[PDB]
Structures are given as C-alpha cells and as structure tokens.
Symmetry: C7
Subunit: 34 residues, 7 copies
C-alpha cells in the first residue's frame, strides 16, 4: 500500500542520510588522529 | 494519496537536510586536516 | 486534509531545524580555519 | 482532530529541540574562535 | 485515542533526548573555553 | 493496537539512540578537558 | 499489518543509524584523548 511504502521510504532515506553523518564524523576522528 | 505524498515529503526533506549536516561535518574534518 | 497538512508541517519544520544544525557546523569549520 | 494535533506537536517539539542543538553548536564555534 | 497518544509520546521522548544532545554540546563548548 | 504499539516503539528506540549520541558527546567534552 | 510493520522498520533503521553516529562520536573522543 502507498502509505506503508511511503513510511518504508522514510526509514530507508532517513537512515541512509544519518549513516552519511556517521561517516563524516569518522572523517573528523581521522583528521584529528592525523 | 495526500497522506502518502506528505510522508514521502518527510523522507525527501528530512533526508536532504541530514545530508547537509554530513557535508558540513566533512568541512570540519577538512578544516582540522588543514 | 488535516493529517496530510500536519505531516507536511513535520517535513517543513524538522528539515528547516536540521539545516540550522548544518549551518552551525559550517560555523565550527570556519572557526577552526580562522 | 487528535491525530493531526499530535503530529503538529511532533513538528513543534522536535524542531524546537533541534534548534537548541544548532545553538549549542554555535557556542562551540564561538569557543573555538576565542 | 491510542494512536494520537503514541504520537504525542514520540514528540515528548524524541524532543527530550535531542535536548540532552544540546546540553552535551554545551559541555563541549565549556571544555574548549577551559 | 499494532499501529499505536509500533509508534511507541519509534519513540522508545529513537529516543534511546539519541541518548547514546548525547553520552558520546559528553565523552568528547571529557577528552578535551583531559 | 503493513503500516505497523513499516513503522517498526522506521524505529529499527533510524535507531540503528543514530547509534552509528554515537559510535563515530566516540571515535572522535578517542582521537582527542590520543
Ligand atoms: Na571529506
Ligand atoms: Na556508519
């Protein structure tokens, strides 16, 4: 159904974007270590 | 449907904004490295 | 409809607030760089 | 309606909290500048 | 209604947790200043 | 009801995860202080 | 039901992603400490 599919898109898109934030923060850690 | 379309808008808008956060954090990493 | 409109308000308000976070992080990068 | 009002409360409360995060990050930038 | 009440709980719990993030970031600002 | 229960699970899981972020940021503050 | 299951997926995916952010921030704390 369209509502369920839209909610699954929230899960997918928002989780993926938040994982991009996590990766950027790992890049901060790497810069500090360097 | 309007509810499904609104939920898709949450996915799109919130994910895009979170990506902006990731990019800004990458700028912090670059600032430290430099 | 009121439910769809409320969900659109979540998209708008939450995305805008997250963009403010991104901008503040840009300010951190600028501070580090001098 | 109660569901629409509850969703509006999500928009208001979560956006306001995220703005507090943005402001705290601005304070970090000003600390670094000092 | 149970759905409206659950949505209100999202607003309450998620906003409160995000405020804790803001407070922690203020601690980082204070640590830098010290 | 299953929808209300699922929404309550969003409140619980997401708030708890955000609290982990707050703690991690307190650890950054401690690292800077030390 | 499909809507309830989709909402549970939001809880799971978004919480997991936010935990990844917490772990990345811990890496920053460790980098500062080192
Ligand atoms: Na980068
Ligand atoms: Na990650």
């Amino acid at each position: 159904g369209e509502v369920a599919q839209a909610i699954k898109e929230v899960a997918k898109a928002v989780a993926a974007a938040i994982k991009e934030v996590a990766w950027a923060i790992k890049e901060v850690a790497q810069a500090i270590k360097g």
